[PDB]
Amino acid sequence: DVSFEFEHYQVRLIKSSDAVTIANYFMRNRHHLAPWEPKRSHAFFTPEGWKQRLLQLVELHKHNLAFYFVVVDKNEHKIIGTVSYSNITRFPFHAGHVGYSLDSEYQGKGIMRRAVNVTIDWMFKAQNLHRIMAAYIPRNEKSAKVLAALGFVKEGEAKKYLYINGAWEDHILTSKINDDWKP
């Protein structure tokens, strides 16, 4: 099954047996991630909430409708990042949205750059997507740099795009196009 390794990390599809570790990761990083993401339900921080979500994701993956990757620190046996491909459409768009997160203690190590690059490559080659879209709040410099480094091209800006922490936030829209897409 789908697995990528570099240094002491492993990037792979999330599994049902990840329920506790993924809940631990979002609990651990609750404060760090809170100002950048929409309001989260209680189930989002719990292993029982993730048990249910994982049932849905297994089903989504069966139909090639979603691909939720975790970044594992093999030294620590814990999840330290996520790379999620969602809102996948086939004909006539062949597009998906990518969203990612990283543990607050693993910043500035090029992990997100690598994890996203290897998964985009797989989404293009193994899943035959034509387009991956990403959107980030302009003051999220780390996110901007990652996307630029990976050859995502800025497409414009949607003002007041997503409701986060009680306010509409502008987002830069960016995308990467797969020239080798097969009809």
Place this chain on the structure above:
Amino acid sequence: DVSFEFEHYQVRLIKSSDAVTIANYFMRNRHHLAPWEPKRSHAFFTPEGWKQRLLQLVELHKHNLAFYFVVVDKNEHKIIGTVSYSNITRFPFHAGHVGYSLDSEYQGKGIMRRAVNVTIDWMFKAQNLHRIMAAYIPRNEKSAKVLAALGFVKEGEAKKYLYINGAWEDHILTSKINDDWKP
């Protein structure tokens, strides 16, 4: 002295008291190592040979001239690996050579990568080395992957470099440079 622990392992400087256990380790891995390393004398595989060797090493440790680390399985109280920093030069090179080995029953667990990573980090930060050199036979894929994972950069190739098991063996030359070295 210097000590690193992870899982059920400890990486530390070798000591006089290790004479028997280091001997057992090389005697245990004699055959797995013969195709990969230079011919060793008989004394290399005896506790008495190491007593002497250790008296020299203990001395090199004292004047920061050499750092011979062992990897210990704390559960079994056995040495299962080595990481040796030798050929150390201060001004105007600030460089040394790393050589390492792992017990053949302990392969595939990333033990070597972690042992070398944590000690390179110490050589850079606590010993202020500028450069660590490593060289490997191209068909030693296990060694190549360790070095790649730790960010060693290929500098070239030395044909017919070391005489091993009755023939001169080509070696890839690699290094890691400490950008934070202080003059």
